[PDB]
Amino acid sequence: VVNQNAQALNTLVKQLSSNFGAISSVLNDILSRLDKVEAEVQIDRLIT
Amino acid sequence: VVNQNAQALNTLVKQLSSNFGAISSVLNDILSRLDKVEAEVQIDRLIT
Amino acid sequence: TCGTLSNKSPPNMTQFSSSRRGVYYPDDIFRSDVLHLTQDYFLPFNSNVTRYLSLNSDSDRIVRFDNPIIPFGDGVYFAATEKSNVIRGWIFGSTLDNTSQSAIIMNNSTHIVIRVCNFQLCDDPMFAVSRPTGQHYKTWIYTNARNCTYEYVSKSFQLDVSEKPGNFKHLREFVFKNVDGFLHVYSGYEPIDVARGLPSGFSVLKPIFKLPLGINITNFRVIMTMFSPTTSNWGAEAAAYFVGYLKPTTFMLKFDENGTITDAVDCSQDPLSELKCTVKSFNVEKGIYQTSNFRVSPTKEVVRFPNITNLCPFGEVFNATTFPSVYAWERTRISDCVADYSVLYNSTSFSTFKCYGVSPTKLNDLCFSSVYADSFVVKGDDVRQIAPGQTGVIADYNYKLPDDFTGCVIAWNTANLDATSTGNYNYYYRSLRHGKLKPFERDISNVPFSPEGKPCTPPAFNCYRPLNTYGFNPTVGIGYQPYRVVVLSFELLNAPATVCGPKLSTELVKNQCVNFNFNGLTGTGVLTDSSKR
């Protein structure tokens, strides 16, 4: 029971490294590199 | 119980016929027809 | 002509609290019977506001009549409290000189007047009004208004002089915002009976104007009356005004059935305010609740770029005497320099400036681990083909961009250079090949081409020279005219910055929540020393 709940949180943080089809897994990297006109398309892919 | 588990798998395979808003339900048909620059947008809709 | 002043004290800058004062409708969307939580420039609750005054002493021996130039932030909360209608209007602008346009807003004696001009403002812009019954006399506001590009005048009204002494009876509240060229004015009115300061209380300000002024508003100052019984020895009396600055904050707003705001929570104000905003509700049952951070938001920004000052050689790279032929395009490293593109604006205008994986106006504040520039000339008709996934004689046989390209394609017409007839250097493209190039592959071979896989020993049937000249005569139409192209390919690796945008750089701020930008890597957080290696 401890291991299952520990593991679930560990997979949940690791899921933040997924791109979900954005140009980057990193939010600051999109916002650094793209303008709102087209950053928001990429940010919405990470949010969803 | 048999019927429910049969029907759950049958609906799962049939759900591969959905487009999910891609140009085609058929993955080979996107990859056949579109460049990687813009197939990936379609593939991601199928993947997700 | 203008009035003049003397024996004038400096402003004292006494400060007061905007106690729940100065809420306004954040946008034009009609909402009814809903709670809306929103981020916008609002005046925070219990924010400081700076007071400015108009008071004679026992005699003209010393006077306050405060019309300093007041900075305009992302916006201003302004409240006038008065009895004798002293505060007539405002000048909004940049320099507040005839060297730049300013907006004048006057609650003039019978009309609201809005004018945008290059104004020669008076040194102390004011009305003069004959005290006992004179609704007007003269307006020492400006000498000249040279280039008036906007005017508005409201319908006729009357003002009471209300010259009686004592407590201030009127509180007039305003919010000014300047967004997308519009000056937004919100206002509200409250009956008051107070001797000093702002009274505490909730206020919502309704939209009064959207003004399509288009001015660069960064400063303002108030226009006030001075009074005389004899049209001489004008004096200042009976008013104060308070200025507060809007700051980007989250508010939760409650909209009536009629869609009026009737309560608001400043989510940053208290823990109870953060709770109310977290549970999206103005009433909260007994309990313990997890609360989302509205406590702290970054205000300072730290921008830190390598101290390389040398500008990139784009003038040299772009204004070469001749470029490569597209079949023999040349690649060059660009390094240890500041990629200021604005140096070109005086010299070359680009018909194409299309960037991939980078937005062309974030480009000014990135830094790159490496940059390569590929140079060649093509038809204006062919510049289409310099993009990922294109096809045609250039993309197939001369210059292929990769599908994963990141970089910018830059092109400009050079008929005044490359299509001169004066002994001119010829430009060539490969027209025939046995296969398509790979991305950033080159083929400078000039062996004769046969459609059959055979040697030629030309001249022979089914043998052709592979390279065609471009017809860059000066007579040809713009599709056939030469365009120079450079393709800048970037990479943004975890490696030392080699080219940077022109951003100025600022001191470190540590142990505070800040915005930061290191070599274009930008975020928000707390910076500290570290044990990391």
Next chain:
Amino acid sequence: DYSVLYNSTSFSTFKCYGVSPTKLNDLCFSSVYADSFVVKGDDVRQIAP
């Protein structure tokens, strides 16, 4: 084969819908129709969905 044309004519526009121009070289089509006309160079923008 469009490469037959690369020595005769360069196209100011070659814009494809539902098919990418590169993959165009290795598809087959159940049918093709060609609609032919002349317009201003200024009007060519209007021939798109």
Next chain:
Amino acid sequence: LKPFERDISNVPFSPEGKPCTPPAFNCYRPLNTYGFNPTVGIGYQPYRV
């Protein structure tokens, strides 16, 4: 400029922050004419927007 802002100022511009009185080194007239001669190529021709 910010969006939909205008700047009709015509003071002499220095690349240095310090002002000038022209004619002088390191300052320039900020405004340049378009060369809308009837001879110029189509990129240089005037378009109304």
Next chain:
Amino acid sequence: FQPFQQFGRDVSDFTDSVRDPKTLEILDISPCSFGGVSVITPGTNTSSE
């Protein structure tokens, strides 16, 4: 309605009312098939009733 309001929406953003621009009359908009409908059947292959 408020004097300048043109349409109204519930908490679902369902446009439930609109001001007729000619009459200035306020119209309610209902969904085209409000409420539940359900069909009782014995099996097909025993009756089509």
Next chain:
Amino acid sequence: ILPDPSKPTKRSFIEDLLFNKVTLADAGFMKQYGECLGDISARDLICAQ
């Protein structure tokens, strides 16, 4: 199975075996405020959380 007054723990003897026999993934809640700003090796899934 009762507590022992000769021990600092107010658990029984059996209960002290049970509490030793299960190992917590974080060894307890107190990953305190200062503790994640550590060395490069001190990166930790609990700090990532």
